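## tool: complex_structure
## caller: assistant
## args:
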Amino acid sequence: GLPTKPGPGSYQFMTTDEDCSPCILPDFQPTPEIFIPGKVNNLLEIAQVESILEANNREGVEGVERYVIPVSVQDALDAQIYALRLELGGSGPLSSSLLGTLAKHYTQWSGSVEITCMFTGTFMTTGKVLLAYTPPGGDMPRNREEAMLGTHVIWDFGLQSSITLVIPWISASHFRGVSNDDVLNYQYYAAGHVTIWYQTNMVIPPGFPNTAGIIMMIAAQPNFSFRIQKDREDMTQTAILQ
Amino acid sequence: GLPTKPGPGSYQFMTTDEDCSPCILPDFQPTPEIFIPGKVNNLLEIAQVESILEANNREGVEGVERYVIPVSVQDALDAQIYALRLELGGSGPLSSSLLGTLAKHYTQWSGSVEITCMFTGTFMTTGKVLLAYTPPGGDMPRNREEAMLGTHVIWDFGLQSSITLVIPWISASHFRGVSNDDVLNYQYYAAGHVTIWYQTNMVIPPGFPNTAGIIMMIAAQPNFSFRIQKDREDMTQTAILQ
Amino acid sequence: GLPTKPGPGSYQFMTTDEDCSPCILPDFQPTPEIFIPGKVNNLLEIAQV
Amino acid sequence: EACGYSDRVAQLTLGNSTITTQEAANICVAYGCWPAKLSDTDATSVDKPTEPGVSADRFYTLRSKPWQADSKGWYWKLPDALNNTGMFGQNAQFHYLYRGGWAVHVQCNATKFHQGTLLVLAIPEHQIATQEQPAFDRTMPGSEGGTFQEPFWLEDGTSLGNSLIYPHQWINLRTNNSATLILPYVNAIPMDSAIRHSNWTLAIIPVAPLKYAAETTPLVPITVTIAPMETEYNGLRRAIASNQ
Amino acid sequence: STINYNNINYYSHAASAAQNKQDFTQDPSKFTQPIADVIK
Amino acid sequence: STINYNNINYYSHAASAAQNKQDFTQDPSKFTQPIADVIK
Amino acid sequence: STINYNNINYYSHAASAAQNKQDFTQDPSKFTQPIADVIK
Amino acid sequence: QAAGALVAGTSTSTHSVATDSTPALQAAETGATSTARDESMIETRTIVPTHGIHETSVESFFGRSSLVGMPLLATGTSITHWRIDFREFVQLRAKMSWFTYMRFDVEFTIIATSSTGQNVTTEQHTTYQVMYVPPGAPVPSNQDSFQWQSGCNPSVFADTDGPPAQFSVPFMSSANAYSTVYDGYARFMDTDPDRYGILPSNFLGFMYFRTLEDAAHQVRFRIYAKIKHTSCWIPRAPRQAPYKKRYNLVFSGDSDRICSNRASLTSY
Amino acid sequence: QAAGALVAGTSTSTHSVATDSTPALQAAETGATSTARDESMIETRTIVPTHGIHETSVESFFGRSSLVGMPLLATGTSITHWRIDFREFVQLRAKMSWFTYMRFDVEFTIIATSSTGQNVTTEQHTTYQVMYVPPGAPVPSNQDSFQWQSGCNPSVFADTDGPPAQFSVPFMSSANAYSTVYDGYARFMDTDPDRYGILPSNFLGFMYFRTLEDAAHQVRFRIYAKIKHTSCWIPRAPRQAPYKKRYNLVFSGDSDRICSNRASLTSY
Amino acid sequence: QAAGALVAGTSTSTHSVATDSTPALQAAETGATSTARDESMIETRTIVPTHGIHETSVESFFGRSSLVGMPLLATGTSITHWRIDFREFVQLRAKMSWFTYMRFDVEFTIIATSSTGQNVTTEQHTTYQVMYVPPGAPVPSNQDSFQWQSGCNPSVFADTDGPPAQFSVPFMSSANAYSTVYDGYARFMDTDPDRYGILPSNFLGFMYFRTLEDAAHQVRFRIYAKIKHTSCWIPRAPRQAPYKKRYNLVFSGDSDRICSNRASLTSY
Ligand SMILES: CCCCCCCCCCCCCC(=O)O
Ligand SMILES: CCCCCCCCCCCCCC(=O)O
Ligand SMILES: CCCCCCCCCCCCCC(=O)O
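## result:
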């Protein structure tokens, strides 16, 4: 017969191998493909859809209320509303979102992110907030004067319930690692901070609720992509399921 | 020689594999194919031929008489003649037929079925029966008023000995499983019931036989197909044959 | 290299197999075929006698 | 869109015999094939064959059988049943090989006051078997025919219900007076010995028993008339009538 | 729903080849309508 | 950044073939803008 | 009844090849009619 | 070669009120199967044929390997054999019961397994020889016998612990098709019941096995057969009773019934 | 087939001072995702699209083998089986949780390993048989059982110590796509909680295993499944709570939170 | 290359009543075989040629492997050899007896098997060397011997427990065809009976065997030869008496008969 030289890798089984194997039921003719709404071709189609951030993650807050960052009438000027370290890596508010649990499956990322906030106060209650993205290098802005030096947006409460803060892809790299792995020093891939401040103040009519809220949503933008699939660390098993 | 990489599946023997093997007698020239009547190319050609149902399966009835459902002069109105749960799966009258033992070899089915009944009474004996197919969802019709609400045919005894009740393919699926497997919950694939009733009554001249019969035959229709071959559960062996 | 799937029958030796094997003396050039009377091609030629 | 009118009357004429019927159920031609002679390409036996024609290609009527209340069924093997009757039998005996088709006419008349249903079957290679392997008198019963002991199993371990896959007609008294089957030759080889192999088996089985408008009931017989068709014989020698 | 296979047989004899993937159309009429005077 | 693969399947059935290397372009709008009166 | 095989030899020498599948027509006359003055 | 034949479809229907056209009315006495179609019995909608019929084709039905033989080689003799039939095991035999005549090629696959006296698997590496012994060839008497030279008989040699042996066989009968059933006798001037239903043309001989050196452990041969390139003629009522013997059709037939019984025909 | 689709790019932007065009202002009540692009929020430079999106494609996401079954064959019986689901192990199950309907083919790879009573590896060479037992086929009771003839059921035979066994399977459901989730009951006239969320159309049967000779040592089968030729419809909020049972979605839900907690929302 | 030659056919015949043409009448004295055909002796029908003749072709007849040698390597020496003839085993030798001259190529296949002192199979893995030792080359004396360097002699190395070794050989004779028979002497000025019927041109030498390391167990070599690319001349009356010796045609010839005897020529 034809002389051959089987080499290394023979009989090895690679889970990502792209080989054609024999069909056990060669004559089987499957049912037709029918029409079904919502076909998805790329997980990136899902990443581009806004999901609510579990932003109110203060110790002691139990579900659903974790989805609403509180805003209230102040008695002080230039006050802070929120701080969030921009990470797609484990633990944080960002990690449980649609974009975040999608990142649990990949090891590298790139692209711009978008944050849309919706105000929940009464129609008569007003306010102006400042949302800021601070590129990396140092720590979280201490005051609003420092925060306004970065990429920001000034939001005015009105008939338009929401505002969008675009967190542009500002990296030296092209790609960042999604993990903050301490052993491999992945904090090298630090992406900065997003902070929220009172620009004016939340002011209400007499007797109105002195506390309202902000619902933060997040989605990936069109220039966003993921690389290298890996396993979710939060999906575990201690025994076979039955 | 030519570098190669034998992979998983090497040396494995799959009974449904479609490979070409070496011929042990390469020079052998077989006898010519001669003409023989009745060549069959698809088992579906056989499925489309009517066979008699073992319908009179009442406890205590022994062979041949099991092939004749009895009809008799009634003293009551709107009376019932027969009930059959529409299943191609084991045990029932349907399973021993041509279509039924063919189903013993497959795991899924689809298509319309046809039931032709032939009356065996004397030429002078008359009658009108109602044959009904009830799509699934509930139980067997309790009375004729309930049965007539489904798919039915009114049969008039006369010079035409037989009538046909078409049991149309009315399914949500496209394909149904032939088994009623309790462990996998295949009763999910329930197909309904066929019932027979007196529309009028069997009336005879004086002295004539007060009991006659109906011979039920069943066949698959042209839109009928089977999928996935499996083994017959009724063809067993306890030792090698000799 | 080229992905392959050796199957059943591998390494088996069938006496009626029609395979080509390596020649042990690849450069050997045999003596010419000369004329000899009575060449037989089919045993049926003998059966008919 | 209609199923009974001028198909009820029929006349078949073969050689010097003609059959008529006023209550038929059309004619069944097995597998849609009409009897035919052996092709030059399908053939193997080199001798020029004997083609008897009218002397053998005609209708033969066997002894009638009475349809009784306890009757289980009857059967005849072909060519066996006719191997010793008339000019057909002579040719079958004198030759080592035979090939041929059949024209079968089963008849059973009663009255509009009776009711009963007979299944008439033409079974190819009907190899029989009961709780034990059959003896010569059961496998080749000759013109007298045999009787089913296990009709539900069709004497072969299969089923009466699925036997409709074989060429057949029904004689349902409220409808018909008889059955007519035309059968082509069937075998896995071109020709065969008439005394050692039975190609077809004619079976008549009561499915709905005979009942009448009284308890007595006159004698109601069943008669079988059969005609060999498109026959040819090879391997002429002395006459040999059975495989015993 | 129309599985078209590769013929290709590396051997000399036809017996060596794999199973015929071709579908011949069925004609049930030899069994369903074996009557001479066909009515519909 | 444009991996073009070789189709080639040595088997009769489509199921036997390797994974589809083709990239279909995504349309997020079924999920991002499911509103009737689309505004920009 | 006409087995046509594939030549194909992956080796340099003719000896390496498989058996000749060709059928040469026989001529029994060298043995059946070796007479000079042939009569029929 | 393409397997794209489809099942039939359904076209739309409407109400009928005809005093002439009556398709519901049949006459089964003719031996003909019903002529009624879905469309003529109910108001039907249109359905485009989307289902295939290849898995019910004669080729697909038989085209898969099944156990047909299972000879056991003892350590004392180091040799067994197998009479070539497909009548020893019920599954394949019952599949063939659907037809009267079948013409086909066969693909045999042989798997060898060594065991201990207590029938537990053991490691054993030798070469075995499978030799085709056709009717008239001399049979081997020992592992030593000269008949194993295989001067004319074809043979296959493979390792006990190597991949399965495998080869194809043409349609070999002296007949024009094999017969699954035979209403006749095996010989002339003989009327013995043991010779009724026996068609010698279907028996091509034996397969003899031996190890190339006296066996240390048991060794069992499982012979699988794949029917391919199939042609079938004359469908039959399939086998319903169990098979008792290898060479005839006798059955037990105690209770004359096949399907299950119930209390009333009017209730389940 | 080419996988060269790219991510989007960035084009240059300048200062805006408009009393009409305001893309920063949204209204999330509509259910629509934000319309704002980088360019409309900051002065941006030009960036040519250089990144690919193939690793996030539905095919690439599912197109790799994962453990789905792991039956253990005991030495006393020499036979086990596996109910065909992808619900026994969490990793693959959670990947599928992203979609409601999925249509695909599967590539199974089976790796066999022998061990001692103390679960340490041992050397053992035999041939095992994997047989597909569809719903309605009779199940094997012993290593001996006649059901292993495999007359119709397909089977795969491979060595314990040989390369992994492997084969492909078409899309088999009676449905037009498999459902990862089902808000309904398995049967009519039945309302049992054990039958809620159970869609029988997804269960194609069992895989039965045995050794061709009584087993000397344990033998464990690891079954890997590769989803290929994938079509997905209707994305879902993925699974966040751990899986407790194989046939339902119950979760523990003690602390109602998913991400980590912190002292203040104003400090890390 | 196509093997489609057919057997002859039969055409129709009629009655003859001729006082001149008489084909039934022959004269066997001429040495010629009968001239009568079926058609001229009986009224015949037409038969179209449907039978092939390839299985009786000289190539098909010889084209299959047969045992020709079977040397045994002892553990003490770890070396044997085989004189290259096809006269040691009767089956092939008798096949060749049909012809006087044969020109052909050969395909050798060698199967090695290890055994114990009691000739039972044992496991043994080594590499063996088969060396062609042509007339005039020095013969090896030990497993150690320098002759195994194989500087010019060709050699084949294979494992004891690996697939069979195999190779082809051209037509090697100094003559123009091998002779199965020789009515002459091997040497000039010599008239010894041991040298009558011995044609040295047919003896190409020996095959020497050894294990690459001293043998632990027996090891037996079975040498199979397949004659291919065959040319045959001058058919002979084949061998009827059994073969007693390897290098001559002596036979026992006790009872001067070949077929069986019977009581009368007039009854069976
Ligand atoms: C190695 C020599 C192979 C010769 C095999 C011939 C196989 C033919 C099988 C025919 C089975 C006939 C059906 C039956 O068993 O009744
Ligand atoms: C060897 C016989 C192979 C038959 C395999 C069919 C595999 C289909 C897997 C479908 C998984 C459905 C999803 C689920 O587990 O809920
Ligand atoms: C490995 C070296 C191979 C050389 C083999 C030459 C084989 C020629 C065989 C000729 C047999 C002559 C006939 C006879 O035995 O009388």
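## assistant note: The CA atoms of residues 9 and 16 of chain F lie 7 Å apart. The pocket of myristic acid (ligand 3) is lined by residues C 24; J 84-87, 106, 132, 169, 172, 178, 202, 204, 207 (CB under 6 Å). Handing back to user.
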